[PDB]
Design a protein around this ligand. Sequence first.
Ligand SMILES: *[C@@H]1O[C@H](CO)[C@@H](O[C@@H]2O[C@H](CO)[C@@H](O[C@@H]3O[C@H](CO[C@H]4O[C@H](CO)[C@@H](O)[C@H](O)[C@@H]4O)[C@@H](O)[C@H](O[C@H]4O[C@H](CO)[C@@H](O)[C@H](O)[C@@H]4O)[C@@H]3O)[C@H](O)[C@H]2NC(C)=O)[C@H](O)[C@H]1NC(C)=O
Ligand SMILES: *[C@@H]1O[C@H](CO)[C@@H](O[C@@H]2O[C@H](CO)[C@@H](O[C@@H]3O[C@H](CO[C@H]4O[C@H](CO)[C@@H](O)[C@H](O)[C@@H]4O)[C@@H](O)[C@H](O[C@H]4O[C@H](CO)[C@@H](O)[C@H](O)[C@@H]4O)[C@@H]3O)[C@H](O)[C@H]2NC(C)=O)[C@H](O)[C@H]1NC(C)=O
Ligand SMILES: *[C@H]1O[C@H](CO)[C@H](O)[C@H](O)[C@H]1NC(C)=O
Ligand SMILES: [Ca+2]
Ligand SMILES: [Ca+2]
Ligand SMILES: [Ca+2]
Ligand SMILES: [Ca+2]
Lengths: 70, 71
Amino acid sequence: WKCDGQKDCSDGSDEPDLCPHRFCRLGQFQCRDGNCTSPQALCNARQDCADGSDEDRVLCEHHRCESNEW
Amino acid sequence: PKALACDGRADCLDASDESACPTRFPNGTYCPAAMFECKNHVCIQSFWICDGENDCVDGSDEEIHLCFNIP
Ligand SMILES: *[C@@H]1O[C@H](CO)[C@@H](O[C@@H]2O[C@H](CO)[C@@H](O[C@@H]3O[C@H](CO[C@H]4O[C@H](CO)[C@@H](O)[C@H](O)[C@@H]4O)[C@@H](O)[C@H](O[C@H]4O[C@H](CO)[C@@H](O)[C@H](O)[C@@H]4O)[C@@H]3O)[C@H](O)[C@H]2NC(C)=O)[C@H](O)[C@H]1NC(C)=O
Ligand SMILES: *[C@@H]1O[C@H](CO)[C@@H](O[C@@H]2O[C@H](CO)[C@@H](O[C@@H]3O[C@H](CO[C@H]4O[C@H](CO)[C@@H](O)[C@H](O)[C@@H]4O)[C@@H](O)[C@H](O[C@H]4O[C@H](CO)[C@@H](O)[C@H](O)[C@@H]4O)[C@@H]3O)[C@H](O)[C@H]2NC(C)=O)[C@H](O)[C@H]1NC(C)=O
Ligand SMILES: *[C@H]1O[C@H](CO)[C@H](O)[C@H](O)[C@H]1NC(C)=O
Ligand SMILES: [Ca+2]
Ligand SMILES: [Ca+2]
Ligand SMILES: [Ca+2]
Ligand SMILES: [Ca+2]
């Protein structure tokens, strides 16, 4: 949701002026190099980006998911 | 849908939704630098160039004078 122009947050911290250019459509995660993928591809042990920004260690270090998945 | 107009992408069957709206940057440019742009103002990932398919509807990607210089 961060860095997409859609002000999801009231206070406006969601969209800074130091924001990189957005290539992906709304709802799509953006890889660091500019590729796009569906949100479920993040930290799924499968390299879904070219550089694998979805598989960066920091993105997964404190990963969590909903009550219905283990 | 209106939201799909002028997003950089062909959504009208003839890409009319990109064809008649402003530049994206002060330097007179229609597309981000990391991509290839076509004369109807659609723009696409670089590897679509001369792949054999008219990916932007104007077909600028498949004009061979581009990939004479691309292996
Ligand atoms: C989304 O993901 C795709 C892959 O699925 C990305 O594709 C890569 O794009 C980068 C550039 O963004 C390409 O890098 C280019 O590599 C050329 C040499 O290739 C060797 O090194 C690359 C890694 O850099 C290896 O992938 C490749 O196997 C080779 O070992 C360079 O010559 C290119 O240099 C360019 O910039 C310099 C500096 O300005 C100029 O002097 C050159 O003329 C040239 O313009 C460049 O670095 C990379 O090869 C691509 N890889 C693949 C597998 O496709 C997409 O780019 C990405 N989408 C977006 C929008 O970025
Ligand atoms: C019209 O104007 C647009 C800008 O409004 C121009 O597009 C820019 O072109 C420049 C030059 O190629 C781009 O700058 C380079 O971007 C590289 C990628 O970083 C971008 O993407 C990452 C993604 O994570 C962001 O985090 C980051 O903020 C950037 O948005 C950088 O890697 C490059 O850095 C390298 O070169 C510089 C020198 O140029 C060195 O100082 C660095 O150390 C490093 O070696 C560089 O910054 C810029 O990103 C483009 N922006 C967009 C939106 O495309 C058009 O080219 C221009 N067109 C015409 C026809 O005039
Ligand atoms: C294209 O639109 C941009 C928006 O940032 C600028 O207004 C630019 O001056 C425009 N260029 C032309 C020729 O209309
Ligand atoms: Ca947002
Ligand atoms: Ca992944
Ligand atoms: Ca469009
Ligand atoms: Ca093509």
